[PDB]
Amino acid sequence: GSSGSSGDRQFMNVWTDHEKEIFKDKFIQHPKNFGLIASYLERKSVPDCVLYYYLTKKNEN
């Protein structure tokens, strides 16, 4: 990983590995806090991450 910013100029709106890692990184510290986890992920919003929490915690009751 030498080249920092290769390009990816195209607008890509999809949860990527890099993102996921961040979603959890903070979660551990400030769990149940979408206000922060979102602050870091500018590309994403507050009410945008709240969903993920469910997706990962979606079971059949």
Q: How was this structure determined?
A: NMR
Domain presence at residue 53: yes
Which residue type occupies 41? Answer: L
Structural domain of 28: 16-61
Q: Is residue 52 part of a domain?
A: yes
Radius of gyration of the chain from Cα atoms? Answer: 13
Q: Is residue 2 part of a domain?
A: no
Within a domain: 60: yes
CATH of the domain at 30: 1.10.10.60
Q: How many CB atoms lie within 10 A of CB 20?
A: 12
Separation of alpha carbons 7 and 27, rounded Å: 29
CA distance 59 to 22: 23
Name the domain count of the chain: 1
Interatomic CA distance for residues 8 and 13, integer angstroms: 12
DSSP secondary structure code for residue 50 in this structure: H
Amino acid of residue 19: E
Rounded Cα distance between 58 and 39, Å, is 24
Q: DSSP H helical segments within 1-61, as ranges? A: 17-29, 34-40, 46-56
Backbone dihedral angles phi then psi of residue 4, each to the nearest 5 degrees: -65, -75
Residue 35 is classified by DSSP as H
Residue 22 CB burial class (10 angstroms; 0-12, 13-18, ≥19): middle
